[PDB]
Amino acid sequence: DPPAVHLSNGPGQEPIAVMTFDLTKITKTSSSFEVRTWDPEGVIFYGDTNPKDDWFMLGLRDGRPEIQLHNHWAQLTVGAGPRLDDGRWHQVEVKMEGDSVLLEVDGEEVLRLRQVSGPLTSKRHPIMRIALGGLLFPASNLRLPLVPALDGCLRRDSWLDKQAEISASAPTSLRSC
């Protein structure tokens, strides 16, 4: 695994890494990574501009991707795609195209959430945070709670536009797989 990190360190409460982005600079509105796990439930990543009313989470529930999103346009809890909890490395891409959010798993589009978002460079609070392996609000506050810690590995990740990233923080040291 090209430098692979564990998505949760121990209890799986908080994220392993939080990155902050300036939306006025953002061009690339997509993210991509490889994930490996035997765990059927947990958070893969979370993103927000506001943890009360403009947020997004991607995780697994019953082995399969689940997206939760709450913003001015849309509030939803959706599962889609094949199980990913077979301990093999899977390529995932989450992209915003027009007003849609698309999820691709192993080269195939498995979900398209249409009419869920107005442009990034036009939007309100112009800072976006991306949290890897945990949420930035309690799990009990999701639309549909899940147990946050995902026991899996993450590698070959790229988050939004690196030229728009303002800062990156880890709350502890990141362990390798």
Ligand X SMILES: C[C@]12CCC(=O)C[C@@H]1CC[C@@H]1[C@@H]2CC[C@]2(C)[C@@H](O)CC[C@@H]12
The footprint of ligand X (CB under 6 A) covers 29-31, 47-49, 54-56, 69, 71, 94-96, 101, 117, 160
Q: x/- contact string, 111-150, with its own copies (CB under 8 A)?
A: xxxxx---------------------------xx------
- Residue 175 binding: pick among its own copies, ligand X, none (C-beta 5-8 Å cut-off by kind): none
Question: Chain-centre distance of CA 40, in angstroms?
Answer: 16
**Alpha carbons 91 and 104: distance in angstroms, whole number:** 8
- Residue 108 binding: pick among its own copies, ligand X, none (C-beta 5-8 Å cut-off by kind): its own copies
Sort 173 into a burial class: Cβ within 10 Å, 0-12 / 13-18 / 19+: exposed
Cα-Cα-Cα-Cα dihedral of 49, 117, 143, 54, to 10°? Answer: 20
Q: x/- contact string, 54-93, with its own copies (CB under 8 A)?
A: ----------x-x-------xxxxxxxxx-----------
**Alpha carbons 59 and 67: distance in angstroms, whole number:** 7
Q: Which CB sits closer to ligand X, 9 or 45?
A: 45
